[PDB]
Amino acid sequence: MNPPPPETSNPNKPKRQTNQLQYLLRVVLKTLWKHQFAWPFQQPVDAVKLNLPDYYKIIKTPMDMGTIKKRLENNYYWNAQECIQDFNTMFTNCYIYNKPGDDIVLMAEALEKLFLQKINELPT
Ligand SMILES: CCCC(=O)Nc1cc(NS(=O)(=O)c2cccs2)cc(-c2csc(=O)[nH]2)c1
């Protein structure tokens, strides 16, 4: 019931490093990672472990911060916007799979606010 986790490397896809991407790893991701509500989002959802047998029946573009971290470490992204889209997909997936007011959704909401605070201004 678990598909393979999202790719963190792809030899068909060009790599890049930018000041913004470096910041996304060093500052944004590594700070969000330490937040008290980061733990549900540090790895791909394991539907067997977590007893969420419909997770991947609902969520067709899964994403998590562990994957994002590995992508940043591997220079998988072309630019910061591509990485930002992955965070936004992670947050949106949470709102889609769950319901307003759920504890997991309150966690995602808090992390998304902090994320927006940190990406409001990126290095030039
Ligand atoms: C494997 C590390 C622990 C973990 O991630 N647990 C967990 C439990 C659960 N189920 S739970 O009832 O224990 C829970 C409720 C509030 C935070 S976790 C869900 C998720 C989840 C991540 S994204 C998403 O939509 N859900 C994650």
Coordinates of N, CA, C and O and ligand atoms in Angstrom, one line a residue, residues 38-46 49-50 52 55 59 63 90 93-95 97-98 102-105 107, ligand 1:
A38 N 7.2 19.5 13.7 CA 7.8 19.0 12.5 C 7.7 17.5 12.3 O 7.8 17.0 11.1
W39 N 7.7 16.7 13.4 CA 7.8 15.3 13.3 C 6.9 14.5 12.3 O 7.4 13.5 11.7
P40 N 5.6 14.9 12.1 CA 4.9 14.1 11.2 C 5.3 14.2 9.7 O 4.9 13.4 8.9
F41 N 6.1 15.2 9.5 CA 6.4 15.6 8.1 C 7.9 15.4 7.8 O 8.4 15.9 6.7
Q42 N 8.6 14.7 8.6 CA 10.1 14.5 8.4 C 10.4 13.3 7.5 O 11.6 13.0 7.2
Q43 N 9.4 12.5 7.1 CA 9.6 11.3 6.3 C 8.3 11.1 5.5 O 7.2 11.6 5.8
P44 N 8.4 10.3 4.4 CA 7.2 9.9 3.7 C 6.2 9.2 4.6 O 6.6 8.4 5.4
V45 N 4.9 9.4 4.4 CA 3.9 8.7 5.1 C 4.1 7.2 4.8 O 4.1 6.7 3.7
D46 N 4.2 6.4 5.9 CA 4.2 4.9 5.8 C 2.8 4.4 6.1 O 2.4 4.4 7.3
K49 N 2.7 1.4 8.6 CA 3.1 1.7 9.9 C 2.0 2.5 10.6 O 1.6 2.2 11.7
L50 N 1.5 3.5 9.9 CA 0.5 4.5 10.5 C -0.9 4.1 10.4 O -1.8 4.8 10.9
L52 N -2.9 3.9 7.7 CA -3.6 4.8 6.8 C -3.7 4.2 5.5 O -3.0 4.7 4.5
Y55 N -4.1 6.3 2.3 CA -3.3 7.5 2.1 C -3.0 7.8 0.7 O -3.2 8.9 0.2
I59 N -3.8 10.7 -1.9 CA -2.7 11.7 -2.2 C -1.9 11.1 -3.3 O -1.2 10.1 -3.2
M63 N 4.6 14.3 -0.6 CA 5.9 15.1 -0.4 C 6.1 15.2 1.1 O 5.1 15.2 1.9
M90 N 3.4 19.6 0.2 CA 3.4 18.9 1.5 C 2.3 19.4 2.4 O 1.5 18.7 3.0
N93 N -1.2 18.7 0.8 CA -1.6 17.3 1.0 C -2.2 17.0 2.3 O -3.1 16.2 2.5
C94 N -1.6 17.7 3.4 CA -2.1 17.5 4.7 C -3.6 18.0 4.8 O -4.4 17.3 5.5
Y95 N -3.8 19.1 4.2 CA -5.2 19.7 4.3 C -6.2 18.8 3.5 O -7.3 18.7 3.9
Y97 N -5.8 15.4 2.8 CA -6.0 14.1 3.4 C -6.8 14.1 4.7 O -7.5 13.1 5.0
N98 N -6.8 15.2 5.4 CA -7.4 15.3 6.7 C -8.7 16.2 6.6 O -9.3 16.2 5.6
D102 N -8.4 19.2 12.7 CA -7.7 18.0 13.1 C -6.3 18.4 13.7 O -5.8 19.4 13.3
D103 N -5.8 17.7 14.7 CA -4.5 18.0 15.3 C -3.4 18.1 14.2 O -2.6 19.0 14.3
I104 N -3.4 17.1 13.3 CA -2.4 17.1 12.3 C -2.4 18.3 11.4 O -1.4 18.9 11.0
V105 N -3.7 18.8 11.2 CA -3.9 20.0 10.4 C -3.4 21.3 11.1 O -2.8 22.2 10.5
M107 N -1.0 21.3 13.1 CA 0.4 21.3 13.1 C 0.9 21.8 11.7 O 1.9 22.6 11.7
Ligands
LIG1 C1 6.6 8.1 11.4 C2 6.8 9.3 12.3 C3 5.5 9.5 13.1 C4 4.4 10.1 12.2 O1 4.7 10.7 11.2 N1 3.1 9.8 12.6 C5 1.9 10.2 11.9 C6 0.7 9.7 12.4 C7 -0.5 10.1 11.8 N2 -1.7 9.7 12.4 S1 -2.0 10.3 13.9 O2 -3.4 10.0 14.3 O3 -1.2 9.5 14.8 C8 -1.6 12.1 14.1 C9 -2.4 13.1 14.6 C10 -1.7 14.4 14.8 C11 -0.3 14.3 14.3 S2 -0.1 12.7 13.9 C12 -0.5 10.9 10.7 C13 0.7 11.3 10.2 C14 0.6 12.2 9.0 C15 1.7 12.8 8.3 S3 1.1 13.7 7.0 C16 -0.5 13.4 7.3 O4 -1.4 13.8 6.7 N3 -0.6 12.6 8.4 C17 1.9 11.0 10.8

